[PDB]
Amino acid sequence: PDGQYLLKPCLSHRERDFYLHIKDDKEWTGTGIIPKFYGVELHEFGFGELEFIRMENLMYKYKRPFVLDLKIGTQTWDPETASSKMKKRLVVDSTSTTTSLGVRFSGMERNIGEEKPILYSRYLCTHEVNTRDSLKEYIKLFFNDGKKYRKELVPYFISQLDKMIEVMKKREYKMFSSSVLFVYDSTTTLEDKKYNCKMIDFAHNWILSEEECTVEDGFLFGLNNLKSILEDIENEFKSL
């Protein structure tokens, strides 16, 4: 995460279709809930051209990145998932907080000045981060910049989740294996606004006005659960 942009290759139609579909909905593009979308672009690849999505790099100019990926939904497979992945998906969904909370730990990075950064594997989700309490603890740890808890940032994160909930309440799309990405630069001040919370990874988004998706995503359920964990954190951080 060095430069201004992420140029993400389109390996299927779904992500690019989604971004294109919502590119004029100000509820998607004006609310600050997804990365700024610049456009789909062809770039030379192979004998021809490969399509990419150009979007903002949410960590552009971050000095000490803090990154937390939280995968949202009550399942992480959809009607197109390959049978050869399904046993694993079913097991991970059930042994992580996915089926119980609709949200799971997906990985974290903290840069506390002794770099290299401290990396926290997404595989922790089925053991160390397999309960609501342990998930709460790990989010609190994300807010630990190495010297203190950044309690002043939490209202921003809850406010972002509220906007997400507001739009997803409308149930126009289903989204599987998408995440909410939490980031901040620990050298930020509140005024520098080097912190962010966005929905990402729309490679399995279904546009319900153009196609049927029978299975439920539990997306809204997950966002509410995550919001309530943050609100607990906001309380736990008061005694500090």
Ligand X SMILES: Nc1ncnc2c1ncn2[C@@H]1O[C@H](COP(=O)(O)OP(=O)(O)OP(=O)(O)O)[C@@H](O)[C@H]1O
Ligand Y SMILES: O=P(O)(O)O[C@@H]1[C@H](O)[C@H](O)[C@@H](OP(=O)(O)O)[C@H](OP(=O)(O)O)[C@H]1O
The binding site for ATP comprises 8, 55-56, 58, 69
Instruction: Based on the shown chain and the rule CB under 6 A, indicate whether residue 85 belongs to the binding site for ligand Y.
Output: yes
Binding-site residues from annotation for Mg(2+): 201
- In the block, which residue shows the tokens 């989740």? 161
Q: Is the dihedral of CA 119, 155, 76, 173 positive or negative?
A: negative
Q: Cis omega before residue 61 (within 30°)? A: no
- Residues forming a β-bridge with 195: 184
Give whichever of 107 and 117 is closer to Mg ion, judged by the CB atom.
Answer: 107
Q: In the bound complex, what is the minimum distance in angstroms from residue 203's beta carbon to ligand X?
A: 5
Q: In the bound complex, what is the minimum distance in angstroms from residue 67's beta carbon to Mg ion?
A: 12
One-letter amino acid for residue 226 of the chain: L
Instruction: Based on the shown chain and the rule CB under 6 A, indicate whether residue 163 belongs to the binding site for ligand Y.
Output: no
Q: Which does 130 bind (CB under 5 to 8 A by kind): Mg ion, ligand X, ligand Y, none?
A: none
Using DSSP's 3-state secondary structure scheme, residue 88 falls into helix
| Contact set with ligand X (CB under 6 A) | 1, 6, 35, 55-59, 67, 69, 179, 181, 200-201, 203
Categorise residue 226: left if φ over 0, alpha if ψ from -120 to 50, beta otherwise: alpha
- Nearest Cα neighbor of 106 from 56, 180, 176, 160 is 180
> Which residues make Cβ contacts (< 8 Å) with residue 137, sequence separation at least 6?
none
Binder of ligand Y out of 88, 127, 169, 193 (CB under 6 A): 88
Q: In the bound complex, what is the minimum distance in angstroms from residue 139's beta carbon to Mg ion?
A: 18
The answer to whether the CB of 57 falls within 8 A of the CB of 27 is no
13 vs 133: CA distance, rounded Å? 37
Which residue is at the shortest CB distance from ligand Y?
Answer: 85
Q: In the bound complex, what is the minimum distance in angstroms from residue 185's beta carbon to ligand X?
A: 12
- Report 176-235 residues binding Mg ion (CB under 5 A): 201, 203
Instruction: Based on the shown chain and the rule CB under 6 A, indicate whether residue 203 belongs to the binding site for ligand Y.
Output: yes
Q: Which does 236 bind (CB under 5 to 8 A by kind): Mg ion, ligand Y, ligand X, none?
A: none
48 vs 54: CA distance, rounded Å? 19
One-letter amino acid for residue 12 of the chain: S
Give whichever of 150 and 204 is closer to Mg ion, judged by the CB atom.
Answer: 204
Q: In the bound complex, what is the minimum distance in angstroms from residue 26's beta carbon to ligand Y?
A: 29
Binding-site residues from annotation: 8, 55-56, 58, 69, 71, 85, 88-89, 122-123, 201
56 vs 36: CA distance, rounded Å? 5
Judged by the rule CB under 6 A, the positions of this chain that interact with ligand Y are 85, 88, 122, 177, 203
Q: Which residues bind Mg ion (CB under 5 A)?
A: 201, 203
